[PDB]
């Protein structure tokens, strides 16, 4: 490919610096003998180390699209470019155009290339994944809709890369965005829209009958009742088949699903999760749990709670529609007190960054003989 | 030991390459003088760096037994073996059998050995702990019995090493396997075993009296009552002794334990945790909390909830009885959509792996002047 | 500064070793030509790598004050000191006092300095952040007051640095210390202080009327009622302004705050959080949520639950008043079974360390053809 051809060029540059003097001026080489060959062996082993490490840490697909340029990868690519161009420039001007003797020094030049390219690989692992290992900052990530909030520690990242780690943790950690869980507050605010003084109106409101407390208690009671119906239905559904007419787990799932289908439908409607689980999805997860020997409760934990975003179908999450709002340049590093917002189509992740505080530890000595207790009351 | 003797050989190989030419042919050395000694100093400092780093990252006990071979450690050991054997081969064939001059080049050969062995140490830290730093995958780990589920991010690991990290997080994160919390569903399914049409039977079931809702509400009420009794008992037990007859925390624990013992026994029976806490364990934790100045609630948090597996006795967890079920080779790396199962004696951890999605970020500019609000209703 | 001047000296040491032979004895240099210049280029590129990596990982402020000396940073500074002093000593004794020829060897000496100083940078990243990447231990951190407990995995750290990571996770993860949530147990124990036999007294206590169960149920009911009042108040407060008299979010916050202020005050009093939120803090967070387009529930999640310590004001947490109690030297590494206590002014973090167990994995083969199921009951 494009980067693979440049990788082939940067890998064959020391090999070309070795091979060209015995080809272009074969009879002009000084007799090296031992030291040149013992340096070729070190060259080959260091190139093997470089190829294995480059495969291990950089033969992987691009993980994300960021708004501005990855500053550290641009720095590494500019450094590799100026590195290899300066070595080819010195090799063409001061070695090939002069047709040098002392081939041992040419092999030393190629081995210094391999050494400094290994240190470029080391600077790459320093910049790309070791600079943010030490947790310099904390990040409070809050959804703007339901208020679900988790805290994360991050090192020195840019606002781009911090937003990337926040979105990774969003798909892993936050429950999935459900707009149907949000409509009750919207209709309640619109019902207030249907109809000094602002403190007296609040006093008349707080003295009135709280419909919301009793409706939430009654809804929680209905959810517990539908949950108990669902648990009984899924237990008496799983008891209908045996691990051993012979059938595969898909047909066993289709066999036992009509004895749980109505209770699950009523539970997903009362918990407002019915848009998240098609019948095909439930049958695939049912055959999955029947295959792996999972209990009714282990099958049912997918449906009892909300669950994170990566449980669900790949279209229900949408990672290409993320927008990064920031008051400053997103290539700037994190610092104390900045706010950046990760906007999806309906919700947003409001992220404010706080510096992890300077902590002062001190010892104090507790004598283990000073742990004496008396039967007297305290 | 076995690996320690090979470590002594790989550490003494550059030193032997240095020491053998002034011993075997002492009068044949060309006068090096400055450059050889300034290269010995660099050799000694790089060997000190190599010894300190090798102690820091590899002088540690083997952490786990895996089914197949650790592929990266086997690659590193084969690389070290071919490395050192090729250097001894070139040193015996082309240096010792020829009895070379230009000892400066021999010291350069030994320093190139020390350099490439430092880069072997670097390739070791690349392969063993840096390749999986960037979180390529997410892992949904579910117990097959109670359905408890947590999500974890992992990089490029094999299925072996991913299963190892999953088990680390199992002992840290999941509540302990309690088979007594699972018997109610089993007896309920056996009670259904005591006694078109499959949809009508489900309709008659869901219209019947849900015993399960009222039994769960009544059990939760009994657990709250026993919890309140236990809190009162442990508070009035801790008030009987004073931090200051003089006694150590073991005898103070034995003094105040009979005023809390029955309430704790009834709470551990109602929460089905009585097999997990012997009287010796409770007395040791009681003397522990009396020693460290912990409150009754801080003592009691060990017993109120289930708690993770590493709270409990070392025989109650059993890390040697883990079985890895996978449809493919466990030395293969993680990829999107694979399922592997970690089976203990009674339960299993069903782990399905999902690729963390390709995320596209973009900026959008919000003018901070565009945050103007009106008192008008919305 | 102090460390910046020593950094300038260690950076200019190879440059000084290069520049001094053409200045002090200019006419005595042997003609190097190609190889010396091709080694200067490698020197300049490796010094650029060293400067970029040193900026990336070590140009950062000191994060914490520890009781005893950081052992690994002291080892690194002693190593750099003996390193650079030994190189200046050999350069003064055996190069400057002799006024050497073969300047190519002097450039090789300076390049070996730059190489071994890059490996010092590598040993620094090995000791300071790579030795603890592999999770050797688990840590149960419990507050002595309310018993809140979380488990953390750590590698080979000292007790100092483990305590530092524990405090990082304390400010991120534990809910904030609230002494007002603890006074009910203290007054209940003092009420027991107002008034064989120790088992009969416990039997008479556990048979009595449990005031605590009914008071906790009644308090939870009052908290749910005040929460419903607060949700209604904040929704009907946010509906009073529109995103668009024109006003900024501070004045919009001040406009809509008197219609929610009494319900929020009553909720913070019933949940004992009123010392944590001044009116200025609530108005700043209100203007913050009005700015970022957050819902009433997203505004309200700061106040509904306790929340971690870093949500609150910077004086409410106090990172300078931490005391480390340990039975051994805090520079010793973690091992299985040690207990260290992190004491704040009122509470303490009791941390006991357990070794993560030796896990034995094995394969077992499940035939995917062996997943056959029958319609027969099990």
Q: Which two tokens stand for residue B349?
A: 């951890």
State the burial class of residue A62 (Cβ atoms within 10 Å of its Cβ: 0-12, 13-18, 19+).
Answer: exposed
B146 contacts chain C (CB < 8 A): no
**Please, are residues A136 and A128 in contact by the beta-carbon 8 Å criterion?**
no
Nearest to A133 by CA among C320, C155, B152: C155
Residue matched to tokens 């947590």: B150
Helix (H/G/I), strand (E/B), else coil: C214: helix
B188 contacts chain C (CB < 8 A): no
A37 contacts chain B (CB < 8 A): yes
> C110 φ, ψ to 5°?
-70, -35
Q: Which two tokens stand for residue B133?
A: 């730093």
Contacts of C168 in chain A (CB under 8 A): 135, 153, 356, 359
**What does the angle CA C251 – CA C253 – CA C255 come to, to the nearest 5 degrees?**
70
Cβ within 8 Å, pair A373-B247: yes
Of C34, C236, C374, the CB nearest to A247: C374
Name every residue whose Cβ is closer than 8 Å to that of residue C279 and which is 6 or more positions away in sequence.
C261
CA dihedral A76, A82, A83, A88 (to 10 degrees): 150
Strand-pair category, A322-326 with A137-143: unpaired
Name every residue whose Cβ is closer than 8 Å to that of residue C75 and which is 6 or more positions away in sequence.
B52, C127
Buried b (16+ CB within 10 A) or exposed e, A79-93: bbeebbeebeebbee
Distance CA C52, CA A75 (A): 10
Cβ within 8 Å, pair A151-C231: no
Give me the count of residues in chain B. 378
Helix (H/G/I), strand (E/B), else coil: C101: coil
Of C109, C142, C212, the CB nearest to B232: C212
Cβ within 8 Å, pair A67-B120: no
Q: What is the DSSP code string of A144-206? A: TTT--EEEEEE-S-BHHHHHHHHHHHHHHHSBPP-GGGTHHHHHHHHHHHT--HHHHHHHHHH
Nearest to A136 by CA among A330, A349, A333: A333
3-class SS letters over C286-339: HHHHHHCCCCHHHHHHHHHCCCEHHHCCCCCCCCCCEEEEECCCCCCECCCCCE
Going from the C-alpha of B325 to that of each of A292, B167, B172, the distances in angstroms are 10, 14, 22
Give how far B269 is from chain A: nearest CA, Å.
Answer: 22
3-class SS letters over B68-126: CCCHHHHHHHHHHHHHHHHHHHHHHHHHHCCCCCCHHHHHHHHHHHHHHHHHHHHHHHH
B236 contacts chain C (CB < 8 A): yes
Of A193, A322, A373, the CB nearest to B242: A373
Cβ within 8 Å, pair C378-A354: no
Distance CA B349, CA B145 (A): 9
Cβ within 8 Å, pair C293-A144: yes
Long-range contacts of B271-274 (CB under 8 A, 24+ apart): B271/B223, B271/B226, B272/B178, B272/B180, B272/B181, B273/B178, B273/B303, B273/B306
Give how far A116 is from chain B: nearest CA, Å.
Answer: 12
Which residue in B119, B239, B346 has the most chain A C-beta atoms within 10 A of its own C-beta, making it the best mutation to test that interface?
B119
Distance CA C172, CA A152 (A): 7
By C-alpha distance, the chain B residue nearest A308 is B151
- Torsion over CA: A294, A299, A305, A306 (sign): positive
Strand-pair category, A359-363 with C64-65: parallel
DSSP B370: G
Cβ within 8 Å, pair A193-B120: no
Distance CA B265, CA B297 (A): 16
Give how far C97 is from chain B: nearest CA, Å.
Answer: 12
Helix (H) or strand (E) holding A238: helix A211-238
Cβ within 8 Å, pair B192-A122: no
Of A98, A109, A119, the CB nearest to C118: A119
Name every residue whose Cβ is closer than 8 Å to that of residue B74 and which is 6 or more positions away in sequence.
none
Q: Which two tokens stand for residue A203?
A: 């006093």
**Please, are residues B94 and A37 in contact by the beta-carbon 8 Å criterion?**
yes
**Please, are residues C355 and B61 in contact by the beta-carbon 8 Å criterion?**
no
Contacts of A345 in chain C (CB under 8 A): none
Residue matched to tokens 């002494």: C179
Cβ within 8 Å, pair B75-A52: yes
Distance CA C150, CA C128 (A): 25
Q: Which two tokens stand for residue B100?
A: 């070379």
State the burial class of residue C106 (Cβ atoms within 10 Å of its Cβ: 0-12, 13-18, 19+).
Answer: buried
CA dihedral C74, C78, C80, C86 (to 10 degrees): 180
C213 contacts chain B (CB < 8 A): yes
To the nearest 5 percent, what fractions of chain A are helix, strand and coil? 60, 10, 30
Q: Which neighbouring-strand residues pair with B340?
A: B326, B351
Farthest-apart Cα atoms in chain A, separation:
105
Q: Which two tokens stand for residue B281?
A: 């364990």
Nearest to A299 by CA among A260, A345, A327, A338: A260
Contacts of A199 in chain C (CB under 8 A): 258-259, 262
A207 contacts chain C (CB < 8 A): no
Q: Which neighbouring-strand residues pair with C333?
A: C158
CA A236 centroid distance within chain:
39
Nearest to C240 by CA among C264, C220, C265, C260: C260
Helix (H/G/I), strand (E/B), else coil: A82: helix
Helical packing angle, B34-58 and C103-125, nearest 10°: 10
**Please, are residues B224 and C213 in contact by the beta-carbon 8 Å criterion?**
yes
State the burial class of residue C112 (Cβ atoms within 10 Å of its Cβ: 0-12, 13-18, 19+).
Answer: buried
The Cβ-side half-sphere exposure at C151, using a 13 Å CA radius, reads 22
Cβ within 8 Å, pair C297-A146: yes
Of B108, B198, B205, the CB nearest to A35: B108
Which residue in C131, C361, C368, C371 has the most chain B C-beta atoms within 10 A of its own C-beta, making it the best mutation to test that interface?
C361
User: CB neighbours (10 Å) of residue B49?
Assistant: 24
Contacts of C349 in chain A (CB under 8 A): none
The Cβ-side half-sphere exposure at B363, using a 13 Å CA radius, reads 14
Q: What is the DSSP code string of A97-155? A: TTT-S-HHHHHHHHHHHHHHHHHHHHHHHIIIIITTSS--EEEEEEETTT--EEEEEE-
**Please, are residues B152 and A262 in contact by the beta-carbon 8 Å criterion?**
no
Cβ within 8 Å, pair A145-C297: yes
Name every residue whose Cβ is closer than 8 Å to that of residue A255 and which is 6 or more positions away in sequence.
A240, A241, A247, C375
C93 contacts chain B (CB < 8 A): no
Residue B358 zone, left/alpha/beta (φ > 0; ψ -120 to 50; rest) = beta
CA A230 centroid distance within chain:
34
**What does the angle CA C372 – CA C373 – CA C377 come to, to the nearest 5 degrees?**
155
Strand-pair category, B64-65 with A322-326: unpaired
Nearest to B179 by CA among A295, A292, C140: A295
State the burial class of residue C308 (Cβ atoms within 10 Å of its Cβ: 0-12, 13-18, 19+).
Answer: buried
Give me the count of residues in chain A. 378
CA A171 centroid distance within chain:
8
Distance CA A310, CA B10 (A): 48
Nearest to B26 by CA among B138, B83, B101, B86: B101
Distance CA B306, CA B215 (A): 20
Helices and strands in chain A, H and E counts: 12, 9
Q: Which two tokens stand for residue B162?
A: 């991913």
Helix (H) or strand (E) holding B1: none
CA A244 centroid distance within chain:
41
Cβ within 8 Å, pair B360-A322: yes
Residue matched to tokens 């007296």: A200
Give how far B318 is from chain C: nearest CA, Å.
Answer: 8
**Please, are residues B295 and C147 in contact by the beta-carbon 8 Å criterion?**
yes
**Please, are residues A241 and C378 in contact by the beta-carbon 8 Å criterion?**
yes
Cβ within 8 Å, pair B326-C363: yes
Give how far A265 is from chain C: nearest CA, Å.
Answer: 23
Q: After which residues is chain B broken (C to N over 2.5 A)?
A: 195, 244
Give strand ranges (E) for C115-269. 137-143, 149-154
Helical packing angle, A249-256 and A279-291, nearest 10°: 120
To the nearest 5 percent, what fractions of chain C are helix, strand and coil? 60, 10, 30
Distance CA B152, CA B169 (A): 9
By C-alpha distance, the chain A residue nearest C258 is A199
Helix (H/G/I), strand (E/B), else coil: C100: coil
Q: Partners for C (CB, 8 Å, 3+ pairs)?
A: A, B
Which residue in B42, B58, B110, B193 has the most chain C C-beta atoms within 10 A of its own C-beta, making it the best mutation to test that interface?
B42
Cβ within 8 Å, pair B324-C363: yes
**What does the angle CA C366 – CA C369 – CA C371 come to, to the nearest 5 degrees?**
75
**What does the angle CA C63 – CA C59 – CA C61 come to, to the nearest 5 degrees?**
25
Distance CA C205, CA C212 (A): 12
Give how far B61 is from chain A: nearest CA, Å.
Answer: 24
The Cβ-side half-sphere exposure at C136, using a 13 Å CA radius, reads 20
Q: Which two tokens stand for residue B115?
A: 């350099």
3-class SS letters over C221-252: HHHHHHHHHHHHHHHHHHCCCECCCCECHHHH
Q: Which two tokens stand for residue B70?
A: 């650790």
Distance CA B118, CA B41 (A): 16
Q: Which two tokens stand for residue B350?
A: 């069903």
Structure determined by: cryo-EM
Q: Which two tokens stand for residue B108?
A: 């350069």
Cβ within 8 Å, pair A360-C295: no
Cβ within 8 Å, pair B292-C350: yes
Helix (H/G/I), strand (E/B), else coil: C83: helix
Distance CA B222, CA B224 (A): 5
Cβ within 8 Å, pair C136-B372: no
Nearest to C88 by CA among C67, C109, C104, C107: C109
Alpha-helical (H) ranges within chain B are: 2-24, 34-58, 71-91, 103-125, 159-173, 183-193, 197-207, 211-238, 249-256, 261-270, 279-291, 296-304
B347 contacts chain A (CB < 8 A): no
């Amino acid at each position: 490919t494009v980067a693979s051809f440049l990788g082939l060029l940067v890998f064959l540059t020391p090999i070309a610096f070795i091979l060209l003097p015995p080809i272009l001026w074969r009879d002009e080489l000084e007799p090296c003998g031992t030291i040149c060959e013992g340096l070729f062996i070190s060259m080959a082993f260091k190139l093997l180390i470089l190829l294995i490490g480059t495969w291990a840490l950089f033969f992987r697909k691009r993980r994300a699209d960021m708004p501005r340029v990855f500053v550290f990868r641009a720095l590494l690519l500019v450094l590799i470019f100026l590195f290899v161009v300066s070595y080819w420039l010195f090799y063409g001007v001061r070695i090939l155009d002069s047709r040098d003797r002392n081939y041992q020094g040419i092999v030393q030049y190629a081995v210094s290339l391999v050494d400094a390219l290994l240190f470029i690989h080391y600077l790459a692992i320093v910049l790309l994944e070791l600079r943010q290992l030490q947790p310099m900052f904390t990040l409070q990530v809050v959804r703007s809709t339901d208020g679900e909030s988790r805290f994360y520690s991050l090192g020195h990242l840019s606002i781009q890369r911090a937003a990337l780690v926040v979105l990774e943790n969003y798909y892993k950690d936050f429950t999935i965005y459900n707009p149907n869980l949000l409509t009750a507050s919207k209709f309640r605010a619109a019902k207030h829209m249907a109809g000094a003084m602002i403190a007296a109106a609040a006093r008349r409101r707080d003295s009135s009958h709280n419909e919301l407390y009793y409706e939430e208690a009654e809804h929680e009671r209905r959810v517990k009742k539908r949950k108990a119906r669902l648990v009984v239905a899924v237990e008496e559904a799983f008891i209908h088949i045996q691990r051993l007419e012979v059938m595969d787990p898909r047909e066993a799932a289709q066999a036992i699903f009509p004895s749980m289908a109505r209770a699950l439908q009523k539970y997903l409607r009362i918990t407002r999760q019915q848009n998240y689980h098609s019948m095909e999805s439930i049958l695939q997860h049912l055959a999955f749990c029947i295959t792996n020997g999972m209990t009714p409760k282990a099958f049912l934990e997918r449906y009892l709670s909300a669950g994170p975003t990566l449980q669900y179908d790949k279209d229900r999450w949408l990672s290409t529609q993320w927008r990064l709002v920031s008051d400053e340049a997103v290539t700037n590093g994190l610092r104390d007190g900045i706010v950046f917002v990760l906007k999806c189509l309906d919700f947003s992740l409001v992220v404010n960054v706080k510096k992890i505080p300077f902590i002062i530890l001190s010892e104090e000595f507790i004598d283990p003989k000073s742990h004496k207790f008396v039967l007297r009351l305290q």
